[PDB]
Amino acid sequence: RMSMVVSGLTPEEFMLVYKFARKHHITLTNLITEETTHVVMKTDAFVCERTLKYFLGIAGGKWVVSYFWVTQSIKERKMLNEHDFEVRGDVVNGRNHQGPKRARESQDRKIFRGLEICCYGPFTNMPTDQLEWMVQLCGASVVKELSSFTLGTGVHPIVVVQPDAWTGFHAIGQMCEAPVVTREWVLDSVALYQCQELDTYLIPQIP
Ligand code: NI
């Protein structure tokens, strides 16, 4: 069906989404879920902020759409095409880049294909369980302990760390045999819907 969540709106703006939702019988919810079909983003004239809802949207291959879908629809008295209003970027990517699109289409082939990820140590402006949920939506398998990575040569483990929230270490590598990367690895990867090369995000491991 149609189920929307909203991000970056003022209350007045949200009321217009609410109005639109009434005229159309679309569901409007506070929290994103799997049922959520739509993520309505405040854009600048379709570049938005990178929010959790933005990530959980691309990650779920959803309709991540500019608030312009709504106003323009209201202004024309009917539901326009999501296609025409799809967001295209934020700060991992300026306008062009069609992250939500790569995403919305790919679903067979997901960016975290056959990976094992340990979100490790403390994180900030995003709860661990939401980063983990994101990571699964993208295809990864979640691992909770450094020591529980599967010993089957079949998979690729990865440790994810947000170096700030700590004071994890560059000593992770002493405790396992996985590349250790920063959270942006996942976040940039998710925005673009393109598994990014680890090189740029890899963190120093002390022998
Ligand atoms: Ni390999």
GROMACS .gro file of C-alpha atoms and ligand atoms in nm:
model
  208
    1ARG     CA    1   0.000   0.000   0.000
    2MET     CA    2   0.109   0.357   0.059
    3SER     CA    3   0.279   0.430   0.393
    4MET     CA    4   0.479   0.744   0.452
    5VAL     CA    5   0.718   0.878   0.709
    6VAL     CA    6   0.862   1.230   0.680
    7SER     CA    7   1.201   1.391   0.744
    8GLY     CA    8   1.313   1.757   0.778
    9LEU     CA    9   0.961   1.909   0.784
   10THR     CA   10   0.833   2.186   1.003
   11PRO     CA   11   0.493   2.118   1.168
   12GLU     CA   12   0.317   2.333   0.905
   13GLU     CA   13   0.488   2.137   0.627
   14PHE     CA   14   0.390   1.812   0.805
   15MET     CA   15   0.028   1.929   0.810
   16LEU     CA   16   0.030   1.967   0.436
   17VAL     CA   17   0.167   1.606   0.415
   18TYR     CA   18  -0.115   1.506   0.652
   19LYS     CA   19  -0.373   1.677   0.431
   20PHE     CA   20  -0.238   1.507   0.124
   21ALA     CA   21  -0.253   1.179   0.312
   22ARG     CA   22  -0.620   1.229   0.389
   23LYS     CA   23  -0.720   1.315   0.035
   24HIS     CA   24  -0.542   0.995  -0.078
   25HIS     CA   25  -0.584   0.744   0.207
   26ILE     CA   26  -0.210   0.710   0.229
   27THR     CA   27  -0.088   0.602   0.570
   28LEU     CA   28   0.127   0.855   0.764
   29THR     CA   29   0.347   0.726   1.046
   30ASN     CA   30   0.618   0.862   1.283
   31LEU     CA   31   0.866   0.575   1.260
   32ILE     CA   32   1.001   0.413   0.954
   33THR     CA   33   0.940   0.037   0.925
   34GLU     CA   34   0.950  -0.232   0.659
   35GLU     CA   35   0.590  -0.154   0.579
   36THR     CA   36   0.691   0.203   0.510
   37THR     CA   37   0.675   0.257   0.134
   38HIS     CA   38   0.759   0.625   0.122
   39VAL     CA   39   1.012   0.858   0.278
   40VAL     CA   40   0.923   1.221   0.219
   41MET     CA   41   1.229   1.444   0.242
   42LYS     CA   42   1.267   1.819   0.263
   43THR     CA   43   1.491   1.907  -0.041
   44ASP     CA   44   1.645   2.230  -0.184
   45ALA     CA   45   1.524   2.249  -0.549
   46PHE     CA   46   1.601   1.726  -0.483
   47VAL     CA   47   1.917   1.731  -0.262
   48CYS     CA   48   1.845   1.663   0.109
   49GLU     CA   49   2.010   1.618   0.443
   50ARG     CA   50   2.145   1.269   0.520
   51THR     CA   51   1.911   1.145   0.794
   52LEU     CA   52   1.853   0.809   0.947
   53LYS     CA   53   1.518   0.793   0.770
   54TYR     CA   54   1.702   0.877   0.447
   55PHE     CA   55   1.939   0.578   0.507
   56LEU     CA   56   1.676   0.336   0.617
   57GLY     CA   57   1.484   0.440   0.307
   58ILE     CA   58   1.752   0.388   0.046
   59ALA     CA   59   1.849   0.078   0.238
   60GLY     CA   60   1.500  -0.059   0.203
   61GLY     CA   61   1.479   0.028  -0.164
   62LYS     CA   62   1.198   0.274  -0.096
   63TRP     CA   63   1.049   0.578  -0.256
   64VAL     CA   64   1.271   0.843  -0.112
   65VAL     CA   65   1.097   1.156  -0.240
   66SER     CA   66   1.122   1.532  -0.215
   67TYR     CA   67   0.859   1.725  -0.023
   68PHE     CA   68   0.781   1.870  -0.368
   69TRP     CA   69   0.584   1.557  -0.462
   70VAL     CA   70   0.338   1.654  -0.188
   71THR     CA   71   0.300   2.031  -0.247
   72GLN     CA   72   0.299   1.996  -0.623
   73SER     CA   73   0.040   1.720  -0.591
   74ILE     CA   74  -0.181   1.936  -0.367
   75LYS     CA   75  -0.133   2.225  -0.607
   76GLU     CA   76  -0.252   2.005  -0.892
   77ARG     CA   77  -0.514   1.826  -0.692
   78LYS     CA   78  -0.376   1.478  -0.752
   79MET     CA   79  -0.102   1.227  -0.685
   80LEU     CA   80   0.185   1.290  -0.923
   81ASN     CA   81   0.450   1.025  -1.000
   82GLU     CA   82   0.711   0.943  -0.737
   83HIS     CA   83   0.943   0.897  -1.032
   84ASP     CA   84   0.926   1.270  -1.105
   85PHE     CA   85   1.019   1.375  -0.755
   86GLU     CA   86   1.282   1.126  -0.643
   87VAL     CA   87   1.570   1.270  -0.433
   88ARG     CA   88   1.919   1.247  -0.583
   89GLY     CA   89   2.174   1.336  -0.313
   90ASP     CA   90   2.292   1.519  -0.005
   91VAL     CA   91   2.660   1.552   0.081
   92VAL     CA   92   2.790   1.207  -0.004
   93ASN     CA   93   2.675   1.317  -0.345
   94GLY     CA   94   2.544   1.640  -0.497
   95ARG     CA   95   2.221   1.658  -0.696
   96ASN     CA   96   2.286   1.411  -0.985
   97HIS     CA   97   2.391   1.078  -0.807
   98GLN     CA   98   2.080   0.858  -0.803
   99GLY     CA   99   2.135   0.665  -0.484
  100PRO     CA  100   1.771   0.603  -0.398
  101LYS     CA  101   1.738   0.481  -0.759
  102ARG     CA  102   2.023   0.249  -0.777
  103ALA     CA  103   1.868   0.127  -0.458
  104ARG     CA  104   1.508   0.122  -0.559
  105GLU     CA  105   1.602  -0.093  -0.855
  106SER     CA  106   1.878  -0.314  -0.724
  107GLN     CA  107   1.740  -0.552  -0.465
  108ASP     CA  108   1.838  -0.874  -0.624
  109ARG     CA  109   2.203  -0.761  -0.613
  110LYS     CA  110   2.250  -0.563  -0.280
  111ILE     CA  111   2.565  -0.374  -0.183
  112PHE     CA  112   2.646  -0.591   0.124
  113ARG     CA  113   2.605  -0.901  -0.089
  114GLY     CA  114   2.766  -1.165   0.130
  115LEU     CA  115   2.931  -0.987   0.417
  116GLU     CA  116   2.954  -1.037   0.789
  117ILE     CA  117   2.955  -0.705   0.978
  118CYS     CA  118   3.033  -0.632   1.345
  119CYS     CA  119   2.921  -0.275   1.436
  120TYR     CA  120   3.179  -0.240   1.703
  121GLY     CA  121   3.211  -0.018   2.004
  122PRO     CA  122   2.999   0.291   2.083
  123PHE     CA  123   2.821   0.508   1.824
  124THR     CA  124   2.650   0.849   1.840
  125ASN     CA  125   2.367   1.009   1.648
  126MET     CA  126   2.249   0.664   1.537
  127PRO     CA  127   2.163   0.365   1.758
  128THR     CA  128   2.358   0.054   1.692
  129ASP     CA  129   2.052  -0.153   1.626
  130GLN     CA  130   1.943   0.086   1.352
  131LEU     CA  131   2.289   0.074   1.189
  132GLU     CA  132   2.265  -0.306   1.210
  133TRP     CA  133   1.915  -0.303   1.061
  134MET     CA  134   2.041  -0.078   0.787
  135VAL     CA  135   2.332  -0.310   0.724
  136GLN     CA  136   2.100  -0.616   0.688
  137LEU     CA  137   1.861  -0.433   0.454
  138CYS     CA  138   2.170  -0.388   0.240
  139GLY     CA  139   2.236  -0.762   0.246
  140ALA     CA  140   2.495  -0.810   0.519
  141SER     CA  141   2.477  -1.062   0.799
  142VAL     CA  142   2.509  -0.914   1.149
  143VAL     CA  143   2.760  -1.034   1.404
  144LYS     CA  144   2.763  -0.912   1.763
  145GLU     CA  145   3.102  -1.020   1.888
  146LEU     CA  146   3.447  -0.988   1.737
  147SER     CA  147   3.487  -1.357   1.814
  148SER     CA  148   3.173  -1.478   1.632
  149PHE     CA  149   3.273  -1.409   1.275
  150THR     CA  150   3.214  -1.726   1.069
  151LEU     CA  151   3.532  -1.928   1.010
  152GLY     CA  152   3.400  -2.046   0.674
  153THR     CA  153   3.626  -1.911   0.399
  154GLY     CA  154   3.296  -1.851   0.225
  155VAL     CA  155   3.241  -1.510   0.387
  156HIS     CA  156   3.405  -1.172   0.431
  157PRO     CA  157   3.402  -1.022   0.779
  158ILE     CA  158   3.427  -0.649   0.845
  159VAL     CA  159   3.457  -0.446   1.162
  160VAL     CA  160   3.269  -0.110   1.173
  161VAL     CA  161   3.377   0.152   1.414
  162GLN     CA  162   3.293   0.521   1.468
  163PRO     CA  163   3.623   0.642   1.613
  164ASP     CA  164   3.475   0.948   1.780
  165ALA     CA  165   3.228   0.796   2.025
  166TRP     CA  166   3.535   0.641   2.194
  167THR     CA  167   3.799   0.765   2.446
  168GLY     CA  168   3.720   0.105   1.986
  169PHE     CA  169   4.095   0.118   1.912
  170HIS     CA  170   4.350   0.058   1.636
  171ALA     CA  171   4.402  -0.259   1.829
  172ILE     CA  172   4.099  -0.432   1.689
  173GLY     CA  173   4.318  -0.627   1.449
  174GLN     CA  174   4.487  -0.786   1.749
  175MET     CA  175   4.154  -0.940   1.837
  176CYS     CA  176   4.052  -1.060   1.488
  177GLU     CA  177   4.116  -1.105   1.118
  178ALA     CA  178   3.890  -0.852   0.961
  179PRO     CA  179   3.949  -0.514   0.804
  180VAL     CA  180   3.848  -0.237   1.042
  181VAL     CA  181   3.651   0.045   0.891
  182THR     CA  182   3.482   0.365   0.986
  183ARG     CA  183   3.104   0.410   0.996
  184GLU     CA  184   3.116   0.633   0.690
  185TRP     CA  185   3.210   0.319   0.502
  186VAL     CA  186   2.853   0.197   0.561
  187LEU     CA  187   2.691   0.542   0.536
  188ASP     CA  188   2.855   0.653   0.212
  189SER     CA  189   2.792   0.305   0.082
  190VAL     CA  190   2.428   0.322   0.165
  191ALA     CA  191   2.372   0.679   0.025
  192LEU     CA  192   2.512   0.587  -0.312
  193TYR     CA  193   2.381   0.237  -0.293
  194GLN     CA  194   2.731   0.129  -0.397
  195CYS     CA  195   2.951  -0.084  -0.174
  196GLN     CA  196   3.248   0.148  -0.148
  197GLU     CA  197   3.607   0.036  -0.153
  198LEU     CA  198   3.748   0.000   0.197
  199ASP     CA  199   4.073   0.174   0.116
  200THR     CA  200   3.959   0.521   0.214
  201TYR     CA  201   3.792   0.414   0.534
  202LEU     CA  202   4.034   0.155   0.665
  203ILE     CA  203   4.176   0.220   1.009
  204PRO     CA  204   4.531   0.153   1.137
  205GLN     CA  205   4.582  -0.171   1.324
  206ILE     CA  206   4.870  -0.196   1.572
  207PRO     CA  207   5.054  -0.531   1.530
  208NI      NI  208   3.690  -1.233  -0.157
   0.00000   0.00000   0.00000
